[PDB]
Amino acid sequence: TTGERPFSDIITSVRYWVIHSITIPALFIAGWLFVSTGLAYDVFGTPRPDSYYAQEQRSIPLVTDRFEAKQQVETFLEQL
Amino acid sequence: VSYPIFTVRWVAVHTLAVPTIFFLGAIAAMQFIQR
Amino acid sequence: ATNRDQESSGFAWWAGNARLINLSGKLLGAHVAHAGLIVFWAGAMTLFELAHFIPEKPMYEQGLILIPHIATLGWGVGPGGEVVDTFPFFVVGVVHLISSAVLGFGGVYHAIRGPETLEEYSSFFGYDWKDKNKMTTILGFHLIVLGIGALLLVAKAMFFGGLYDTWAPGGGDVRVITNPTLDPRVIFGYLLKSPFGGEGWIVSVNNLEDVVGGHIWIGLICIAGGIWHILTTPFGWARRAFIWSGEAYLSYSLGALSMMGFIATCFVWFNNTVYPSEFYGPTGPEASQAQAMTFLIRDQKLGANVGSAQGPTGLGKYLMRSPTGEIIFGGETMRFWDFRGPWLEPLRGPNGLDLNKIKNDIQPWQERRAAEYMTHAPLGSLNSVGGVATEINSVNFVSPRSWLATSHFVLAFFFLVGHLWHAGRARAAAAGFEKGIDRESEPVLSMPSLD
Amino acid sequence: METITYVFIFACIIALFFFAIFFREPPRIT
Amino acid sequence: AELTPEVLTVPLNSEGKTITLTEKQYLEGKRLFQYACASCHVGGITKTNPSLDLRTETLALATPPRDNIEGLVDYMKNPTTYDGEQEIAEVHPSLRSADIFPKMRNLTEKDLVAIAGHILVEPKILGDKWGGGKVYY
Amino acid sequence: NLWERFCNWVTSTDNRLYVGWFGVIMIPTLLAATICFVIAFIAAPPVDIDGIREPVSGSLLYGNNIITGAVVPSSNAIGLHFYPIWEAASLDEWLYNGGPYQLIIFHFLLGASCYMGRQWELSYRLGMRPWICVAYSAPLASAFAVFLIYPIGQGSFSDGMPLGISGTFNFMIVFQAEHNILMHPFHQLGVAGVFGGALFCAMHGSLVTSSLIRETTETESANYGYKFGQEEETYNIVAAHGYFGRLIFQYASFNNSRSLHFFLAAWPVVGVWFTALGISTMAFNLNGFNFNHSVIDAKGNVINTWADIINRANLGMEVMHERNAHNFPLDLA
Amino acid sequence: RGWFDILDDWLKRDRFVFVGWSGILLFPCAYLALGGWLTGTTFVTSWYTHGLASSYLEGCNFLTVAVSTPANSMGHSLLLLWGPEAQGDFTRWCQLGGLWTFIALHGAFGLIGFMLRQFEIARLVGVRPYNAIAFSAPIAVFVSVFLIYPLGQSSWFFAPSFGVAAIFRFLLFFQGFHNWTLNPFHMMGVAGVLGGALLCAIHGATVENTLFQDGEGASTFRAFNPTQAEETYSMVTANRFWSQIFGIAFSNKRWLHFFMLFVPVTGLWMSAIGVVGLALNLRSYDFISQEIRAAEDPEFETFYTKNLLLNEGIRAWMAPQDQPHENFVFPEEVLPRGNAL
Ligand code: CLA
Ligand code: CLA
Ligand code: CLA
Ligand code: CLA
Ligand code: CLA
Ligand SMILES: CCCCCCCCCCCCCCCC(=O)OC[C@H](COP(=O)(O)OC[C@@H](O)CO)OC(=O)CCCCCCCCCCCCCCC
Ligand SMILES: CC1=C(/C=C/C(C)=C/C=C/C(C)=C/C=C/C=C(C)/C=C/C=C(C)/C=C/C2=C(C)CCCC2(C)C)C(C)(C)CCC1
Ligand SMILES: CC1=C(/C=C/C(C)=C/C=C/C(C)=C/C=C/C=C(C)/C=C/C=C(C)/C=C/C2=C(C)CCCC2(C)C)C(C)(C)CCC1
Ligand SMILES: CC1=C(/C=C/C(C)=C/C=C/C(C)=C/C=C/C=C(C)/C=C/C=C(C)/C=C/C2=C(C)CCCC2(C)C)C(C)(C)CCC1
Ligand code: OEX
Ligand SMILES: [Cl-]
Ligand SMILES: [Cl-]
Ligand SMILES: [Fe+2]
Numbered sequence A: 001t002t003g004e005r006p007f008s009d010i011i012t013s014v015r016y017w018v019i020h021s022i023t024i025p026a027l028f029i030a031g032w033l034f035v036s037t038g039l040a041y042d043v044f045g046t047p048r049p050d051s052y053y054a055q056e057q058r059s060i061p062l063v064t065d066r067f068e069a070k071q072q073v074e075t076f077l078e079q080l
Numbered sequence B: 001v002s003y004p005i006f007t008v009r010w011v012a013v014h015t016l017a018v019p020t021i022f023f024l025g026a027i028a029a030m031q032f033i034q035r
Numbered sequence C: 001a002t003n004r005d006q007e008s009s010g011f012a013w014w015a016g017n018a019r020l021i022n023l024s025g026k027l028l029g030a031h032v033a034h035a036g037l038i039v040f041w042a043g044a045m046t047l048f049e050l051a052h053f054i055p056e057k058p059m060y061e062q063g064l065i066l067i068p069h070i071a072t073l074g075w076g077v078g079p080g081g082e083v084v085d086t087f088p089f090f091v092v093g094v095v096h097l098i099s100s101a102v103l104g105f106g107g108v109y110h111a112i113r114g115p116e117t118l119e120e121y122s123s124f125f126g127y128d129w130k131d132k133n134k135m136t137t138i139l140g141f142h143l144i145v146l147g148i149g150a151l152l153l154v155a156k157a158m159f160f161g162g163l164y165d166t167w168a169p170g171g172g173d174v175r176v177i178t179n180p181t182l183d184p185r186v187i188f189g190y191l192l193k194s195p196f197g198g199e200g201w202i203v204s205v206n207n208l209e210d211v212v213g214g215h216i217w218i219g220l221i222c223i224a225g226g227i228w229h230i231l232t233t234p235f236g237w238a239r240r241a242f243i244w245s246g247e248a249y250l251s252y253s254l255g256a257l258s259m260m261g262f263i264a265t266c267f268v269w270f271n272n273t274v275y276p277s278e279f280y281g282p283t284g285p286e287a288s289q290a291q292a293m294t295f296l297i298r299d300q301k302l303g304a305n306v307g308s309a310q311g312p313t314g315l316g317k318y319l320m321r322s323p324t325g326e327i328i329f330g331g332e333t334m335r336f337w338d339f340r341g342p343w344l345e346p347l348r349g350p351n352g353l354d355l356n357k358i359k360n361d362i363q364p365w366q367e368r369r370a371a372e373y374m375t376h377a378p379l380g381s382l383n384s385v386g387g388v389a390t391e392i393n394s395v396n397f398v399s400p401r402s403w404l405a406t407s408h409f410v411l412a413f414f415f416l417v418g419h420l421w422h423a424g425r426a427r428a429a430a431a432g433f434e435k436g437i438d439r440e441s442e443p444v445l446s447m448p449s450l451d
Numbered sequence D: 001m002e003t004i005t006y007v008f009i010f011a012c013i014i015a016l017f018f019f020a021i022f023f024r025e026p027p028r029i030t
Numbered sequence E: 001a002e003l004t005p006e007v008l009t010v011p012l013n014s015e016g017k018t019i020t021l022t023e024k025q026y027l028e029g030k031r032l033f034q035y036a037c038a039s040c041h042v043g044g045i046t047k048t049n050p051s052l053d054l055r056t057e058t059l060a061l062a063t064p065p066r067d068n069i070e071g072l073v074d075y076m077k078n079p080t081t082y083d084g085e086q087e088i089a090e091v092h093p094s095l096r097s098a099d100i101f102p103k104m105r106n107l108t109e110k111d112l113v114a115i116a117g118h119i120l121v122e123p124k125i126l127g128d129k130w131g132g133g134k135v136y137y
Numbered sequence F: 001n002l003w004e005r006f007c008n009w010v011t012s013t014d015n016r017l018y019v020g021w022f023g024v025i026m027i028p029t030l031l032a033a034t035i036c037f038v039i040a041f042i043a044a045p046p047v048d049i050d051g052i053r054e055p056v057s058g059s060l061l062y063g064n065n066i067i068t069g070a071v072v073p074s075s076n077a078i079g080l081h082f083y084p085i086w087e088a089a090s091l092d093e094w095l096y097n098g099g100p101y102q103l104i105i106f107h108f109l110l111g112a113s114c115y116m117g118r119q120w121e122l123s124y125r126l127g128m129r130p131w132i133c134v135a136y137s138a139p140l141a142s143a144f145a146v147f148l149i150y151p152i153g154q155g156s157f158s159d160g161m162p163l164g165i166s167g168t169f170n171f172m173i174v175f176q177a178e179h180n181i182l183m184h185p186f187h188q189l190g191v192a193g194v195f196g197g198a199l200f201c202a203m204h205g206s207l208v209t210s211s212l213i214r215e216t217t218e219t220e221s222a223n224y225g226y227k228f229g230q231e232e233e234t235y236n237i238v239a240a241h242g243y244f245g246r247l248i249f250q251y252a253s254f255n256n257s258r259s260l261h262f263f264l265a266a267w268p269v270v271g272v273w274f275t276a277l278g279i280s281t282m283a284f285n286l287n288g289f290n291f292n293h294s295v296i297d298a299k300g301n302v303i304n305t306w307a308d309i310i311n312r313a314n315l316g317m318e319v320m321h322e323r324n325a326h327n328f329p330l331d332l333a
Numbered sequence G: 001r002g003w004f005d006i007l008d009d010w011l012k013r014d015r016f017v018f019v020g021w022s023g024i025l026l027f028p029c030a031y032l033a034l035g036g037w038l039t040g041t042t043f044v045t046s047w048y049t050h051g052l053a054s055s056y057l058e059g060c061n062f063l064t065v066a067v068s069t070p071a072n073s074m075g076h077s078l079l080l081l082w083g084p085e086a087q088g089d090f091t092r093w094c095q096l097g098g099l100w101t102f103i104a105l106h107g108a109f110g111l112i113g114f115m116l117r118q119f120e121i122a123r124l125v126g127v128r129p130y131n132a133i134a135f136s137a138p139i140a141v142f143v144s145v146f147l148i149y150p151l152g153q154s155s156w157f158f159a160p161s162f163g164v165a166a167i168f169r170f171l172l173f174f175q176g177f178h179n180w181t182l183n184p185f186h187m188m189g190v191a192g193v194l195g196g197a198l199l200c201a202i203h204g205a206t207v208e209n210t211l212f213q214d215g216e217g218a219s220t221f222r223a224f225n226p227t228q229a230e231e232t233y234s235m236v237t238a239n240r241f242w243s244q245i246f247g248i249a250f251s252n253k254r255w256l257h258f259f260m261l262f263v264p265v266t267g268l269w270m271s272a273i274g275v276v277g278l279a280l281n282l283r284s285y286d287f288i289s290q291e292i293r294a295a296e297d298p299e300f301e302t303f304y305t306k307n308l309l310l311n312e313g314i315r316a317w318m319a320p321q322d323q324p325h326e327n328f329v330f331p332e333e334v335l336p337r338g339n340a341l
Helices: A007-011 A014-036 A039-044 A069-078 B008-030 C013-020 C024-051 C067-072 C087-113 C132-158 C184-191 C208-231 C236-241 C246-270 C284-301 C332-336 C355-360 C364-374 C400-431 D002-022 E023-036 E038-044 E056-060 E069-077 E109-129 F002-010 F020-043 F091-096 F099-125 F132-154 F165-179 F185-210 F237-247 F257-283 F306-320 G003-011 G022-043 G090-095 G098-125 G130-152 G164-178 G184-209 G235-245 G253-279 G288-296 G303-322
Strands: C163-165 C173-175 C319-321 C327-329 E009-011 E018-020
Touching (some): A039 G022, A039 G090, C013 C024, C067 C087, C132 C208, C284 C327, C284 C332, C284 C355, C400 F132, C400 F257, E023 E109, E056 E109, F002 F020, F091 F099, F099 F132, F099 G235, F132 F257, F132 G184, F185 F237, F185 G130, F237 G098, F257 G184, G022 G098, G164 G303
Antiparallel strands (some): C163 C173
């Protein structure tokens, strides 16, 4: 009742599924490869399971300065 | 008939749905990560 | 499609089973198919439990709720609850699975293929909910069937191998019950006991002789009531007291089932006789008493005098007095001093726990049992992490007593809600205002003002 | 002194309950 | 941090000889510890006797010392008190009391070595959490 | 016949407050519970709740205000034992061991169950549909969970909720310590029920108030535009539907008033049913989710989550609650 | 006719999703707040700000994921991506908690956009704007809790993190440190929320059980037509029912629905006032008379004193891990414990 095609008319049509049987698996595989190639760790800075601590440390790397925080995180990452 | 395709509704639906399917693929891949 | 839409039936799809109220054949199909579902779950769940069963590990550590029921009947277990043969479990599972196939065939046949109404096909199988004689006759048939089932439990206990007895001399063992308590004083004194602490009503039945005698009484009473309702019509007071309709009978059964669900919750939580701790794990009271016993044993081995040891508040650290004078375990487990278990009763004298038998007569099997029951208390998380809520993730344990009690409290409460729903609706439909207030004849408009 | 105040306020609330139930404006159906 | 072979290197005997566990051996030891011991030894503490625990220092001061693989395997075969003056197999699980502790029936020598290795490796991983109780949760 | 006249009076709809047979049970039990509650809240002596001879004062005369005052639950030494007045040797002993709590909660639970039955009964006498009592079953289930089912599962009426404000807060905090109720899905469904109930209450009220038909002038209150017993609807349902359908989209808005009011009934009632069931299922110690030490790094170090912070708070509550009552390492009940 | 008027015509066009002028503020800000939360809970850690894992990528589930607040050393920094902390680096911005301030600021402006949408749609449709007035209470809650409370405190660190278990931590923090249950403004908030839920349930059940029979269907939902003029339920019958059950009853439908507006909105506003007080640590922590009595009399115990002991336990056992910037080292002997346990 607003000049748009009904959703039931769209999702029951064959052209919709011709498009979306391509697009929906492509996006799902794109997200899968975004995680499984390890790119998400690089983009968001999230540690891998071997990257939380150094080999013989138990201290959590915590940011303690405001305007040198970027350098402090870089120093944390240099210590592996 | 003669319905359009690329409306405001289309844009809203896809701005919600495209990242949703991408994120679902990402989390499904996360389920197979070992320590 | 007969009565299969809202226009002809008056009921929407979400109340679609209410379309079956006056279709006796399809209603019979729904019931038989649902019975097939119940038997299917029994068989399939038994086979699932058996496929993952490790016989040396205790049953209550393995998330089992159906194998303990078979083991309590004496099938497949030896002394101390040790599993000696898993084949009876397999037989029970597969016979239920095959019987569920038969019941599913019958339910499907009567639901979609058989006659929609049974009244034209047979006066015997046809019924009308308003015919009170036919309703009492069907109730009588089912009462006779239930009485036969109770006598089947009696027959298992007395002739076909016996039942597991956790109170048997020398640990729990499979025992044939040869002298069931037929005295009506004992049986109906269980019926008249208080439900509160120290009394426990029928949950407190603590020997298999009382259980078997009670089932003898239950079977005979059910068979006699079945014959009574086959041969007799409802009296005038019964005819004036009840609503006589299908929804009304459903609501009566819903209230009865809600009460039975609450009782089963209390039975599995407190009773360690018909739910032996060898199979279901210790009860909560049992585990608290086990912790007190364990640390009494440990500190007595270190040289402490457990009778004269004084806790932080001045009460006895290990031993104190109940409000009626009995010598009981100290600490918070003072609330659980009515607990009775076969590992604890050898230390009890006439005045409660006895200091001399505590000092000299605690056996290694009792210390083992106390430690095991202390460390398998019915406490755990929804994701099955054993222990208190502050415990870390290493122990995968929730007691089957917890699962059974919680699930059946949920079911009993929802069936009380269903009883209220259907009893109110049956009353309103009998009086004729279940669809709403008549605009022309609104009753409140004919009533005087309150003020 | 504070106990008397609490009991007084509670008793005033109960009296208000009485008047709101039994001496209400009658709902006059029009 | 990773599960390096230096982490998985533990004393074998009291003399000073050491062994290096594989990651499969360590994970099987953790699984068997959770199967047979964790109900009373979760986190390295003892539920039914909290004054003793599975810390490496506590095992080292035991008689005979239990801070090596061979001592822990011997304890799993013949448990004693802390001073080694009395045998406690009737109340503690063991191979010699597998009839009264059924979860010890199918434990092989490799299973005992893996459990002992898990006990010795866990403090090196968890710090004061192992045997620390609820303070270190 | 005197019995026929009494039956006519009991079931009479002309009484200012309906009695009914459920009310024949309800009035004495609720009167007894109310009178004993007022007397105990003002003047009861301290109660040894934990059974360790450590009396807790909850009445106003013994040093409490409205916030801190409570009727203290009965002694842990009593447990689930029935403790009426005649079971005590004297009134001093009955007051010391928390007998008033058992009297009040038993009379209240019976009276509130009969209140539910009375709601059905009056709906039947007025020709109403009968399910207001079903809606009332949700707070009644909550009261049963905190006053009866949780003591039964834990084995003592001392673990029931105290009849006071600060006692209620003590109950909440100790419950979170022992059961981690915040991580329980049934309590989360209950929070969704009450938050959604408040949301949909504000929403329905604002949407009806927004679409009121102009019947009054600017000086008078708009409430005088409605007359009691009038036949026409006092607001434009279509205008409210048009507003709310443009606020989100057309198919998220109710155009059916009956479906909307069923939803208003159903959402908080089902949510509160689930949270009452959560309290009962945690009474049998099926606790909320335990994710302590769930996240582990490659070596094996514990990586803390917010669940570990919640666990630290729960541990603080656990080691401080009932500080003298525990003699043994595990708080098994 | 003027570009402004043509743009106004396009923005106010009837659609599946109404846009309006308020949509320019609402849809980008609301979309970015929701997308930032989903992105943070899916991919972004809290390892450098709190020492926690808080994303699905690290192994947390739906209950334990959060977009955590920035580190306490950030203070009340806006933490703009181009600001002096991140310096345009997206990875460092995520690692420093910039997603938290991103979500908080975009959510605040999205809430503004949604209330402006309520005003604009009410103006176009032709109804009174009471829905926007009712929505002022969630806005007050969000502003007091997520903005005013951390601004009164030392940093954004003590604001709630956007996550389920993180919000549970926030609740337990307010109990342990603020004694927030004792606060009368929180008590008024609880009364408003529970009374709103009660009113919702009771009004829905009352309407559904006083319906007029307007059809022959046993399911009564089809017996209502939206264009009908008559009331669908009996107000007189409902009034008599509640007058005889409860003693009092509504007799004015307009007053009933205004009361349904009034109760939860007023409750939420009272709780927001209390949260402002807690932003300044102006707590209702203790009653001085009870504490003087308990200090001088070692036999005087109430439930309030027991709650104070519980708060001491919460603070001492929670603070070293909940506030890692303080570098709290509480030895085992200083931790307050009861006997045993
Ligand atoms: C235990 C669950 C259960 C059972 C036994 C029934 C049974 C029945 N429902 Mg029903 N229903 C249920 C749940 C159930 N319902 C639920 C949850 C809903 C809500 C969605 C409904 C909604 C509903 C509506 C709206 C209606 C019914 C109706 C009916 C009756 C006729 C169905 C029909 O015409 O089939 C037609 C369907 C089919 C032919 C599809 C195939 C169905 C078969 C049985 C599948 C069997 C699968 C199984 C694996 C086969 C095993 C065979 C093997 C043993 C040999 C029938 C007695 C109707 C009625 O009252 O009729 C008057 C009706 O109108 N139901
Ligand atoms: C032996 C038990 C029993 C029986 C025979 C009936 C029979 C009936 N009920 Mg009833 N009811 C019961 C118990 C029972 N009820 C209980 C315990 C409650 C309380 C919750 C109710 C509440 C109730 C209401 C509120 C209503 C009925 C109605 C009806 C009638 C139509 C039902 C229908 O079509 O459902 C169709 C089935 C569905 C729509 C499916 C519902 C799905 C459920 C609620 C969720 C189950 C979740 C599951 C257990 C766990 C998760 C599974 C996972 C896959 C997600 C029918 C006469 C209706 C009526 O009055 O008609 C006259 C009606 O409106 N019932
Ligand atoms: C509650 C169960 C129940 C009930 C009341 C009925 C009732 C009926 N069925 Mg039906 N049926 C059922 C279950 C049931 N069936 C099951 C499970 C199946 C699958 C095997 C069938 C398959 C079936 C078919 C294929 C036909 C019927 C027919 C009929 C009608 C006539 C039957 C007759 O004259 O008696 C006949 C009586 C007997 C043969 C005596 C049988 C005695 C049994 C074997 C003893 C079993 C012991 C004990 C009672 C049950 C143990 C299992 C228990 C633990 C669950 C009647 C309405 C007929 C019909 O409607 O015609 C139009 C028809 O053609 N039924
Ligand atoms: C499934 C079981 C079942 C069902 C549904 C029925 C159903 C019925 N029976 Mg019945 N009956 C049964 C089994 C059953 N019977 C058995 C096994 C026997 C043999 C002992 C009898 C013997 C029997 C007789 C002798 C009579 C009935 C009658 C009736 C009818 C009226 C019932 C009535 O008002 O009682 C409702 C209950 C009462 C009025 C009792 C008062 C309520 C008290 C206060 C409840 C107290 C219990 C409380 C909940 C606590 C529980 C514990 C307690 C034991 C301490 C009804 C059709 C009557 C009839 O019309 O028959 C023709 C009749 O006279 N029955
Ligand atoms: C209309 C919707 C809207 C609104 C209200 C906001 C609002 C905000 N965003 Mg945001 N954003 C939006 C859409 C929106 N965003 C979109 C669509 C994106 C995707 C590209 C982003 C991406 C984004 C990021 C990545 C970040 C923000 C941030 C911010 C916050 C700080 C912005 C700031 O300081 O610059 C304020 C800038 C202005 C008010 C512009 C002023 C323009 C006027 C007309 C003056 C004229 C200037 C003149 C012509 C040029 C001068 C030239 C020279 C002299 C300099 C603020 C709450 C930051 C944040 O959240 O920090 C935590 C942040 O890091 N936004
Ligand atoms: C409908 C009457 C009953 C009331 C239902 C109450 C519960 C509904 C809960 C809402 C969620 C589910 C909706 C029901 C859905 C339902 O019942 O389905 C039916 C409904 C209508 O489908 P049809 O194909 O019949 O109609 C499409 C029309 O174009 C026909 O002209 O479908 C939808 O709208 C699906 C949702 C997809 C569109 C989502 C758009 C998202 C984009 C962003 C929007 C932001 C809005 C907010 C801005 C501030
Ligand atoms: C009516 C209806 C309905 C329902 C239905 C039903 C409910 C049915 C049932 C059904 C059933 C209830 C079925 C059953 C089946 C079964 C079967 C078919 C089985 C078989 C078995 C077997 C084959 C076995 C096997 C084995 C063995 C021998 C041993 C080993 C293991 C195994 C498993 C391999 C519904 C809802 C859909 C709706 C519509 C209509
Ligand atoms: C097995 C056993 C036993 C036994 C048991 C018995 C013997 C039982 C019986 C039981 C019984 C014998 C029961 C009964 C019940 C009853 C009831 C449950 C009732 C109900 C009622 C009602 C429901 C009513 C109603 C009414 C009223 C209120 C009024 C008017 C109206 C009417 C009618 C509705 C013992 C324990 C020893 C042991 C274990 C085992
Ligand atoms: C931050 C940032 C940003 C943004 C971004 C975005 C905006 C994103 C988005 C995103 C998104 C937008 C995503 C999505 C997601 C989703 C998901 C992940 C979903 C999930 C779901 C599920 C899982 C479901 C569930 C359910 C429910 C809820 C209930 C019922 C059942 C079911 C299952 C159905 C930018 C670059 C601009 C700038 C810079 C920063
Ligand atoms: O009392 Mn009231 O809270 Ca139930 O847990 Mn054991 O007991 Mn006492 O501690 Mn924790
Ligand atoms: Cl406490
Ligand atoms: Cl204790
Ligand atoms: Fe309304």
